[PDB]
């Protein structure tokens, strides 16, 4: 059934699993028309499909042309997500296919189940965790590849950079979730924290800066402070 | 007008015959039901006074044989049997009519309720859902499970309703996942009607039989089947207009006959609200929506 705080270490066992987040698939700006009505204009989106044990991120870029002439786009976006996830699974060798797919939003359950009927042995699960994967478009390199895309495209990343050389996947996922939660609560402050010191760089093949172990402890502490603050600033506490 | 003779009534029992029921006391001089209308299937059903657990009964059509009931003290139930000696049977029914030991099927002349509940129900289709080929009548009880319930444990005692599953390869054409899931017309019209049932009359017959088993025996898998067959039609954007008009009549009479005190367990809130207010057919079931809103506004 659902994945929650009780069964959290399951994410880091040796059964292949993927999280799927659809929150950035259908993205729009809302604007006024010459007549004073309101309209939307789509911008490119992405499906965020992540193996939490290895850090592998299958980032399927959703180009605005897929919405041309279609109705009920928010509903279609869920089915398009499920179609692309199913296509990804079918493209992987059998030994690389997931045994579980965890959707971050429960409205993805029926679309993914129907698209995966050919895979009765892959479990489709919801979660009770409020995971911050919507903030993936606050990662500069990810936002850049999405906004520049001129056609549908899949781009593969490791969202943990090289962290798994020095830390476990539990610790790496916890660091990722902290970073993304911070970027979601106050993107400007979060990004200042990450890029304040100019002597720490992001390698060309990485997404995050090359912090030493000690600097990561300091960074992580700064991000917790932010989340607690903003939580004060918000509820006035 | 046909007759079902009872050898005797050795245990106190409530006997129902279609929508009617009468109370028989232990060893009361009870010898059957006469004046049963010809042309319809019928059900004769039983609830013992001492153990209201297990309602059970028999679907039959008196055109197919001469049937009687006799109490078996070993298996502890009233059993339907066929009498092959027409001479003996006609003689027995006569002697019993003379002594006024049989109750008369109490139908009001104006009343079309039983016809309206069984319009499409045929004994031959009942006998394919309830498989016991050596008898011309069919036993059903409260506890019998359906084939679909058994997939999720005695096959001989199962209700072989047609399996309906909205998240199945049968229901979903490869490449039409969203389309077929959100509009079930291909599963209704091509898979079920053209492929399995052959026509809408057979579909409606099974739907009507499922409802009646739910209502008379509290058979849970039959209630599930009834609602699934309703939901399949309501969730189809494309349904022949004659089928929608007939469904409205069918459901109207089912809702009219449903005991008020059983509506809480026999009606699924989700299905009815979806069907009457959200589905493609939300504006096609006028009679059913009107009786539901006036009789069971709470559920909605
Ligand atoms: C061989 C023993 N079996 C029978 O006599 C079964 N015959 C039925 C028609 C019957 C018999 C006696 C009754 F009082 C009432 C009946 F309905
Ligand atoms: C209008 C009456 N309706 C009923 O259910 C109750 N009428 C009595 C009890 C009755 C029922 C069935 C029967 F075959 C013979 C009967 F006298």
Swiss-Prot record, chain A:
Effect of residue 104 to A: Reduced growth at 30 degrees Celsius. Strongly reduced growth at 16 degrees Celsius
Subcellular location: Nucleus
Record note on what altering residue 23 to A does: Reduced growth at 30 degrees Celsius. Strongly reduced growth at 16 degrees Celsius
Organism superkingdom: Eukaryota
Region (RNase H homology domain): 7-237
Signal peptide: none
More about this protein: Present with 468 molecules/cell in log phase SD medium.
Function according to Swiss-Prot or TrEMBL: Functions as a scaffold that mediates the ordered assembly of spliceosomal proteins and snRNAs. Required for association of BRR2 with the spliceosomal U5 snRNP, and the subsequent assembly of the U4/U6-U5 tri-snRNP complex. Functions as a scaffold that positions spliceosomal U2, U5 and U6 snRNAs at splice sites on pre-mRNA substrates, so that splicing can occur. Interacts with both the 5' and the 3' splice site, as well as the branch region. Has a role in branch site-3' splice site selection. Associates with the branch site-3' splice 3'-exon region. Also has a role in cell cycle.
Domain-level remarks: The MPN (JAB/Mov34) domain has structural similarity with deubiquitinating enzymes, but lacks the residues that would bind the catalytic metal ion.
UniProt protein name: Pre-mRNA-splicing factor 8
Species this protein is from: Saccharomyces cerevisiae (strain ATCC 204508 / S288c) (Baker's yeast)
Gene of this entry: PRP8
Portion held of the full protein: 1836 to 2069 of 2413
From Swiss-Prot, chain B:
One Pfam family recorded for the sequence: AAR2_1st
Residues covered by region (Leucine-zipper): 244-265
Subcellular location: Cytoplasm; Nucleus
Coiled coil: none
GO cellular component terms attached to this protein's record: cytoplasm; U5 snRNP
One BP annotation, GO: spliceosomal tri-snRNP complex assembly
CDD domains assigned to the protein according to its UniProt record, in alphabetical order: Aar2_C, Aar2_N
List of residues that carry Phosphothreonine: 257
Keyword hit for Phosphoprotein: yes
Cited Gene3D superfamilies: 2.60.34.20, Aar2, C-terminal domain-like
Leader peptide range in chain numbering: none
Chief place of localization: cytoplasm
Record flagged with keyword Phosphoprotein: yes
Keywords assigned by UniProt, alphabetized: Cytoplasm, mRNA processing, mRNA splicing, Nucleus, Phosphoprotein
InterPro entries noted in UniProt: AAR2, AAR2_C, AAR2_C_sf, Aar2_N, AAR2_N_sf
Modified residues (Phosphoserine): 236
PANTHER family listed in its UniProt record: A1 CISTRON SPLICING FACTOR AAR2-RELATED, PROTEIN AAR2 HOMOLOG
Protein family per UniProt: Belongs to the AAR2 family.
Function: Component of the U5 snRNP complex that is required for spliceosome assembly and for pre-mRNA splicing. Involved in splicing pre-mRNA of the A1 cistron and other genes that are important for cell growth.
Miscellaneous note of the record: Present with 7330 molecules/cell in log phase SD medium.
Protein name stated in the entry: A1 cistron-splicing factor AAR2
Species of origin: Saccharomyces cerevisiae (strain ATCC 204508 / S288c)
